[PDB]
Amino acid sequence: MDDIYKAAVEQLTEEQKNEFKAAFDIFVQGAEDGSISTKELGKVMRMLGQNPTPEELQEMIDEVDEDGSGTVDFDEFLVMMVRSMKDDS
Ligand SMILES: [Ca+2]
Numbered sequence: 001m002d003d004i005y006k007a008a009v010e011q012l013t014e015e016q017k018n019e020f021k022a023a024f025d026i027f028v029q030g031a032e033d034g035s036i037s038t039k040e041l042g043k044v045m046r047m048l049g050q051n052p053t054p055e056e057l058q059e060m061i062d063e064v065d066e067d068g069s070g071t072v073d074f075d076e077f078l079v080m081m082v083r084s085m086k087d088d089s
Contacts, residue, residue, distance in 0.1 A: 028074070
């Protein structure tokens with residue numbers, strides 16, 4: 001059910017796990033804990049190379065938010081990044 005996402009992050013190698021940190025540092029450096037809202041998350045996706053629609057981006061960020069804050073952090077972004085791939089590249 002949900003383990004498919006947890007297994008993807010575990011299967012991902014360390015070099016890939018660090019890639020998310022480099023992109024997230026752009027907004028984490030100018031933040032306290034490193035949490036972004038959906039309105040600013042669109043810029044994070046466009047900057048990383050994502051083209052998700054607005055009606056779909058809400059679910060993309062709301063479904064990964066488990067704590068219920070409405071803001072994607074490093075942990076949530078890691079689970080949202082593997083879903084944005086879907087197939088091979
Ligand atoms: Ca959150």
